[PDB]
Every structure is written in structure tokens, then in C-alpha cells.
């Protein structure tokens, strides 16, 4: 399990970046995890303890800041979906572009 | 297939909100889709043409603005993952909180 490949593909939200103190602390902790902890981490964040094909660099993972210091635990969503939709200039254009995308792939 | 339930649970990013002109146009188009187009839309955005258990209100879907008007088509990611991580006050605390979350569920 290549957690360097996961670190290199991870995206951030809520104010975090790869340079955030919290994120640098996070990757130090994960790189120091036992193999058992690495498997539990994948189960919690992805819903499985196995890498996908192509290894962990093929995962889509976002780490998002959802509050300041707290006693509350981290949470996850294991099956998020995203539609990337440009701001087309008209309703007519949006319909043609969306129909083309869903119908021809 | 209840697309009103999907509309009610959808989240937005990149500057969109439920009040965005583009988003109001989007939901008019989707509500006017034929059942075939609704199935292709789910396949494109989720990787399957079937509702999950509990119907479409149980989907996690984000619609994110990824540019201005363009000839380029919308894109999707069908299996995104998100770790919601509070900004704990120390590395030690982050380790305890993360280990507790992954080990006890
Ligand atoms: Ca071991
Ligand atoms: Ca039909």
C-alpha cells in the first residue's frame, strides 16, 4: 500500500492545503501507521481495506476542514459524486452540452 | 426515480448555490428529462442507472462550477471520497481522534 501515492493525489477543501500545519501532521501520522492502522484508515475513508487497481494514487480523496479544535471525531463520506458543470451562457446550451455528455459516453 | 428528492439533497461548489441561474436551469432540464435521459444522467454521475436504497434522496451529489461558458462538456467523478477533519490543536490530539474514529467503527 503506497500512501506516498495517496498523499500526492489528495485534494483539500475548507481552508486546508498541502502546506497546512494540520495536513503536514496528518501525513506524518499516516506514514507512521502500522499496516493494520493503514487498512482501518482505508476502510473508514473508502469503504474497503484494499487499494483500487493502480494503487492508492488512483483514489479520489479530499480532506476537508469542518471545524476548529473539538472533542468530536473525524467523519467521512465513502461514495461522494460530483458533476463538474461549466456556467454555460444559456439554458439551451446547458441542455445540449449535458445531453451530449451523458449520451455519448 | 424521484429527482425532486435528488434536487433537495444536492450540494454545490465552485460558486454555485441552489439560487444560481445555471442551477435553476439545470433542474428545469433534468425534471423535463425522459426516463431514458434520467437513467443516462444517473449512469454518468453515479456509475449506475439505478437509485440506491432509500431512493435518489440518499445519493451524495455535488454540482461544482469548473469554468465559465465553453464548448467543453461537463465531466464527473462517480466515486469521490471525503475525510472531514477538524483542525485539532496538536498532532497528539489529531492522532488520538483519528485512531479512535477508524478503530471503533
Ligand atoms: Ca501487521
Ligand atoms: Ca421511456
Author numbering:
A (entry chain C), B (entry chain C): 742 to 846
Paper passage:
The HECT‐type ubiquitin ligase E6AP (UBE3A) is critically involved in several neurodevelopmental disorders and human papilloma virus‐induced cervical tumorigenesis; the structural mechanisms underlying the activity of this crucial ligase, however, are incompletely understood. E3s of the HECT (homologous to E6AP C‐terminus)‐subfamily share a C‐terminal catalytic domain that is comprised of two lobes—a ~30 kDa N‐lobe and a ~14 kDa C‐lobe—tethered by a flexible linker. Both lobes cooperate with each other in mediating sequential macromolecular interactions during ubiquitin transfer; in addition, the C‐lobe contains a catalytic cysteine that forms a thioester with the C‐terminus of ubiquitin in an intermediate step of catalysis. The founding member of the HECT E3 family, E6AP (UBE3A), has key roles in human diseases: its activity is hijacked by the E6 protein from high‐risk human papilloma viruses to promote the proteasomal degradation of the tumor suppressor p53, thereby driving cervical tumorigenesis; genetic up‐regulation of E6AP has been linked to autism spectrum disorders; and the deletion or down‐regulation of this ligase in the brain causes Angelman's syndrome.
We determined a crystal structure of the C‐lobe of E6AP at 1.3 Å resolution. The structure reveals a dimeric arrangement, in which the C‐terminal α‐helix (H14) and adjacent β‐strand (S10) of two symmetry‐related molecules have undergone three‐dimensional domain swapping. As a consequence, the catalytic cysteine (Cys820) residues of the two subunits are either in immediate proximity or at a sulfur–sulfur distance of 4.7 Å, which we interpret as a mixture of disulfide‐bonded and reduced states. We speculate that these alternative oxidation states originate from radiation‐induced, partial cleavage of an intermolecular disulfide bond formed during the crystallization process. We and others have previously reported that the C‐lobe and the HECT domain of E6AP are monomeric in solution, consistent with cell‐based studies on the full‐length ligase. At the same time, the structural reorganization may indicate inherent conformational strain in the hinge region within the monomeric fold. In line with this notion, the hinge region is the shortest among the loops connecting individual β‐strands of the C‐lobe and may thus resemble a loaded spring that releases conformational tension upon swapping.
